[PDB]
């Protein structure tokens, strides 16, 4: 089931760079058994390079390929505002059909600084039943943040969920919003409630915490 | 013009059965190799199914006993029958054109199987209110089954700095959802805030009025 390995992960550049994805097999596949396609966000695949080095119709002369045996290259010559988003190989030589777990390129803008805010539960929400704080981390780049929940500085994991925005068209920045859902009981046993985010833009982790009923 | 269009996907319970069809224009479906490619939701792409030209289908492990490929040529129909479903077919479904035995290189439009054994239920909308110079607020949709919802601000007069965070599954099968928007905060006093949630699946619309805290 030869074993496609595409390189890096994500792949951060501006327009205008040149981006270079690797893909790696397991076993030798011959030249002209390697496909290149693009996919954008919320839409279908896109074949753009057959044999590993010849173009499809329509795809512009940037997209480039080479490689042989189980080392193979995709080469953007020069990036485009368009061309960021996700990248697939797939060899086609033996009867298993194995795609590539996929390679982002995506716009790098300056590292920012994600804006920390804190929402503790309301009134209504509280008299549901049922507690849930809310933290915001507004207009950071790059995606990767750490959002640490500390009840009376005591870390509190497994019972908080991410979700993450789509990358912003202008500012190419992120937003996170992490969401510690817990019990009326045991959101009034604590009172100091905090929400620690490491980002690589923040020199030193920020704090941003709150008093219960304050 | 090789257009293939998409249909028959939709919300069904565990253990279901549907049936994605696949209109082709442009081409033949008797004469050619026709695949189904799906893509798991934050996941990359695996082959399904494919249907050779002399009527040879060959179907993934993943997929063996429970899916069936068709080819309908008299109004050139590719069908896909999905039976004994669980969570793990929940995903964006695309027919494919084969050229060369192995080159995915016309795609259609792609289907959604969303595949969950929950009720429909409406949303609970709870506020997130604020508290220098920029103020963030928001709204948390949760507890709501299935997707999707539309949520604007001030009835759609409020577009700038909204950020709508995608619905996280949740561990009780429901969906939630955060709303936040960061505005001038010297107009938090003087300027009314409404965010308006409209879940269609439920037919169930809120509006809910965002003012300030202590």
């Known amino acids: 089931e030869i074993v496609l390995t595409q390189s890096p992960g994500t792949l951060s550049l501006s327009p205008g760079e040149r981006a270079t994805l690797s893909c790696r097999a397991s076993?030798?596949?011959?030249?002209?058994?390697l496909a290149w396609y693009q996919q954008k966000p919320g839409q279908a695949p896109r074949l753009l390079i057959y044999?590993?080095?010849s173009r499809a119709t329509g795809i512009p002369d940037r997209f480039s390929g080479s490689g042989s045996g189980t080392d193979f290259t995709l080469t953007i010559s020069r990036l485009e505002p368009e061309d960021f988003a996700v990248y697939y190989c797939?060899?086609?030589?033996?009867?298993?059909?194995?795609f590539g777990q996929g390679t982002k390129v995506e716009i790098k803008r300056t590292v920012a600084a994600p804006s920390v805010f804190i929402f503790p539960p309301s009134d209504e929400q509280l008299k549901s039943g049922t507690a849930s704080v809310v933290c915001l981390l507004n207009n950071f780049y790059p995606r990767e943040a750490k959002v640490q929940w500390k009840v009376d500085n005591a870390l509190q994991s497994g019972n908080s969920q991410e979700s993450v925005t789509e990358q912003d068209s202008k500012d190419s920045t992120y937003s996170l919003s992490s969401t510690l859902t817990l019990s009326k009981a045991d959101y009034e046993k604590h009172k100091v409630y905090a929400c620690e985010v490491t980002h690589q833009g923040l020199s030193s982790p920020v704090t941003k915490s709150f008093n219960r009923g304050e | 013009e090789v257009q293939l269009v998409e249909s028959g996907g939709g919300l069904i319970q565990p253990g279901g059965s549907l049936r994605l069809s696949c209109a082709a224009s442009?081409?033949?479906?008797?004469?050619?190799?026709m695949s189904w490619v799906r893509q798991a939701p934050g996941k990359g792409l695996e082959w399904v199914s494919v249907?050779?030209?002399?009527?040879?289908?060959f179907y993934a492990d993943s997929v063996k006993g429970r899916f069936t490929i068709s080819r309908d040529n008299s109004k050139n129909t590719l069908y896909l029958q999905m039976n004994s479903l669980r969570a793990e077919d929940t995903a964006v479904y695309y027919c494919?054109?084969?050229?060369?035995?192995?080159?995915?290189?016309?795609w259609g439009q792609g289907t959604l199987v969303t595949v969950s054994s929950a009720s429909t239920k409406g949303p609970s909308v709870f506020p997130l209110a604020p508290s220098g110079g920029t103020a963030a607020l928001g709204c948390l949709v949760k507890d709501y089954f299935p997707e999707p919802v539309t949520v604007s601000w001030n009835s759609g007069a409020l577009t700038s700095g909204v950020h709508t965070f995608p619905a996280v599954l949740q561990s009780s099968g429901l969906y939630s959802l955060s709303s936040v928007v960061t505005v001038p905060s010297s107009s938090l006093g003087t300027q009314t805030y409404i965010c308006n949630v409209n879940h269609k699946p439920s037919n169930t619309k809120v509006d809910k009025k965002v003012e300030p805290k202590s």
């Open positions: 044999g590993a080095s």
């Open positions: 797939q060899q086609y030589g033996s009867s298993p059909r194995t």
């Open positions: 442009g081409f033949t479906v008797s004469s050619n190799y």
């Open positions: 494919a054109r084969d050229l060369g035995t192995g080159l995915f290189d016309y």
């Open positions: 249907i050779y030209s002399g009527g040879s289908t």
């Open positions: 076993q030798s596949v011959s030249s002209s058994y």
